[PDB]
């Protein structure tokens, strides 16, 4: 007698003879495992590693005849160490690279039994999941990272997965804060995947991430534009100043070269030209041609009335051709990527 | 008497029939768990990861009537492996990124049983906890970093957290010597937080950090100021020295960018403009204008009043640029100091 003893003998009756080796209703119809997620945060998104780190509260909800009990109206909340004594789904993340269940104080697990035998099983998880990124639009791109949930051991003949509440099964997307990215939306999918060993159930959670251009405007585009404008100071300096005109020009070209090579050190060595690379090569041509501008005028001024006329005409043209053409190139660049 | 045989058999009866699966007073009112923390150190605070590392002695006090014993005056202290044989609440830290309990020699845990059944459970923990930071005032900012404490499984119907001793429940914050920050204030909060599965008890410990500007004055502002001053040396050099005033101009412009490239490494890739970034672009404007000044002077001179105009602009730039940068420098600091 006494409710403490009554519960103790009730739980023992549930577990005495309970075979953890057999799934619920083994041999019979497949057991449906409903699950839902509360996202804690996305720690980081890495292009160099082509992955992102996701922290979440992952929960599973299934029915087991063997755990039904009567005489107790309460939903028994047992110590998390009971997880070692119960059958639980072999769910796993297919695209996961590295993950762990948080273990501070005591391993972060929850089990909540109910009279009819339905079990709620919860975990707090951090997973570094692979996410391949189409960097051709970088940094004006948007990406589709996903988490791929699947059962390892049991095929569709034994396990069925479903989102509890449909589209309402995932929460916490509102509290994901990232410097570079803002979540345009998230999407939930359910599928059956077929391997050589059979057809397995799948649930997929997808995030569409759109990048923030603020950082790259200040750090990359503004320098390149300012250095390119700096190249036009050459056209206004007198043509007799060979030392100054050349020194201004070559140093500008040198600066553009270092900017071009530097940025690729912070991101994966992907073998194709990105949107920003096209811009930096576009800027390079202008600063490079702005140096040849002085190369020819020097040749015409000294080595070839052509000494007085053509030398002045070419320099005067450059003061309007270069600024105009750079704006023409700049206008086409943003209309191509931002407006289309 | 307190013979070890008597103590052994006493401890055996307490554990005989004990069930770790059930909380104290199961089915009855909630278990009152009293938290208590002694801060050992805050190892580091990093903006690039939006997190800080904290090491602490973490203790929990609760009463379990199943462990009450009589005939022993002592508060029994036992080998820490008794922890695996007893019920201990499932406290955890919400915003931690990765954490571990120290394991040198033997896992740093403590259990001390009192005659009335009160259990003292303590363990030394090092936690790396997330702290989102507002960098809109980077060298001149203030930050709130918190440690959130919660029970994973048991709702408020089963467990009630509280700070044992009230505002005295956290100690050692008096003694945290952070190099880049200073603990202006800390405060303790308790509340109930509701999810779909129920209302859970929560305690949270908050620190308010104010930064030390010393490092950034030495490494970013003074270099920016001195290079900006150096750019004004062009105005004193004669206009005829084209190669000199251009070299003095181009070099300063590319030194300002060299400062930005270093700042590109110390912080996360944030979209918005920070206070330091605003100052660097402020300096870049003066350094950039310091070279446009010569370009127009060279154009005016070589393109006899023209000789006078070139000299006059040097006289104007010799006064306007130092005066305007001082005015800009004055307005900048007053904004971030008064606000």
């Amino acid at each position, epitope marked *: 007698p006494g409710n403490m003893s009554f519960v103790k003998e009730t739980v023992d009756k549930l577990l005495k003879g309970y075979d953890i080796r057999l799934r619920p209703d083994f041999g019979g119809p497949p057991v449906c495992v409903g699950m839902n997620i509360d996202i804690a945060s996305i720690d980081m998104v890495s292009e160099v590693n082509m992955d992102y780190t996701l922290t979440m509260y992952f929960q599973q909800y299934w029915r087991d005849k063997r755990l039904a009990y009567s005489g107790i109206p309460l939903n028994l909340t047992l110590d998390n160490r009971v997880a070692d004594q119960l059958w639980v789904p072999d769910t796993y993340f297919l695209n996961d690279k590295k993950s762990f269940v948080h273990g501070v104080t005591v391993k972060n697990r929850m089990i909540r039994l109910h009279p009819d035998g339905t079990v709620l099983y919860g975990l707090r998880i951090t997973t570094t999941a692979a996410c391949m990124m189409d960097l051709r639009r970088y940094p004006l791109d948007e990406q589709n990272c996903t988490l791929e949930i699947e059962s390892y051991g049991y095929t569709t003949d034994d396990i069925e997965f479903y989102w509890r509440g449909g589209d309402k099964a995932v929460t916490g*997307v*509102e509290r994901i804060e990232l410097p570079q990215f803002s979540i345009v939306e998230h999407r939930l999918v359910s599928r059956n995947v077929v391997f050589a060993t059979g057809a397995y159930p799948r649930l997929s959670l997808s995030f569409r991430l759109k990048r923030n251009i603020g950082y790259f405007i200040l750090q990359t585009y503004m320098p390149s534009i300012l250095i390119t404008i700096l190249s036009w100071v050459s056209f206004w300096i007198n043509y007799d100043a060979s030392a100054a005109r050349v020194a201004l020009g070559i140093t500008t070209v040198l600066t553009m070269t270092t900017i071009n090579t530097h940025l690729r050190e912070t991101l994966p060595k992907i073998p194709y030209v990105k949107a920003i690379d096209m811009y930096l090569m576009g800027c390079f041509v202008f600063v490079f041609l702005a140096l040849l501008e002085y190369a020819f005028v020097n040749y015409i001024f000294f080595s070839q009335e052509l000494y007085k006329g053509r030398a002045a005409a070419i320099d005067r043209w450059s003061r309007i051709v270069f600024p105009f053409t750079f704006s023409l190139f700049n206008l086409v660049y943003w209309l191509y990527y931002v407006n289309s | 008497p307190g013979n070890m045989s008597f103590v052994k058999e006493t401890v055996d009866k307490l554990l005989k029939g004990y069930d770790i699966r059930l909380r104290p007073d199961f089915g009855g009112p909630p278990v009152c768990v009293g938290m208590n923390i002694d801060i050992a150190s805050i190892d580091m605070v990093s903006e690039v990861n939006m997190d800080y590392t904290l090491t602490m002695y973490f203790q929990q006090y609760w009463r379990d009537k199943r462990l009450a014993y009589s005939g022993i005056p002592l508060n029994l202290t036992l080998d820490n492996r008794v922890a695996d044989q007893l019920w201990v609440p499932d406290t955890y830290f919400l915003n931690d990124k990765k954490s571990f309990v120290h394991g040198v020699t033997v896992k740093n845990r403590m259990i001390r049983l009192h005659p009335d059944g009160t259990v003292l459970y303590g363990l030394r923990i090092t936690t790396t906890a997330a702290c989102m930071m507002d960098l809109r005032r980077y060298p001149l900012d203030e930050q709130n970093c918190t440690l959130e404490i919660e029970s994973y499984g048991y709702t408020t119907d089963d467990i009630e957290f509280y700070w044992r001793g009230g505002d005295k429940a956290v100690t050692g914050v008096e003694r945290i010597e952070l190099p880049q920050f200073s603990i202006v204030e800390h405060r303790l909060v308790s509340r109930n*937080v*509701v999810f779909a599965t129920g209302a859970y008890p929560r305690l949270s410990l908050s620190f308010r950090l104010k930064r030390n500007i010393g490092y950034f004055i030495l490494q970013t502002y003074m270099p920016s100021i001195l290079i900006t001053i150096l750019s004004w040396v062009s105005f004193w050099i004669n206009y005829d020295a084209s190669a000199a005033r251009v070299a003095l101009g181009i070099t300063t412009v590319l030194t300002m960018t060299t400062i930005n490239t270093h700042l590109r490494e110390t912080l996360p890739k944030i979209p918005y403009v920070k206070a330091i970034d605003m100052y660097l672009m402020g300096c870049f404007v003066f350094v950039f204008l310091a070279l446009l000044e010569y370009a127009f002077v060279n154009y005016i001179f070589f393109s006899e009043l023209y000789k006078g105009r070139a000299a006059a602009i040097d006289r104007w730039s010799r006064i306007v640029f130092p005066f305007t940068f001082s005015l800009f420098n004055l307005v900048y600091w007053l904004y971030y100091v008064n606000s």
Partner: nanobody
Amino acid sequence: GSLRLSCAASGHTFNYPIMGWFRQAPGKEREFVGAISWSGGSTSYADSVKDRFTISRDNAKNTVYLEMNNLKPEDTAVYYCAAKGRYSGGLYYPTNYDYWGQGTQVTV
């Protein structure tokens, strides 16, 4: 008909990234309506206002807006505006919101 509500904030709004709209009538529990995130733009709603209302924000003016479009008679209530901490619990529960507005009445 249609209507629009505005909610302005000041102070340490960085510590309270999410703003929520709640509504109540005498003799009834306080209901959830929707929420918006500073700097994130993501929004969520109650099913009773899906596709009828829309919450938007101006991050520079520090104001949250609820485009109360496509009214119905059952929308009579005082629409409190509230803020939520970063690490508080679920959105749909008023107990998680610390700072609350004056609750402007609307009648339909």
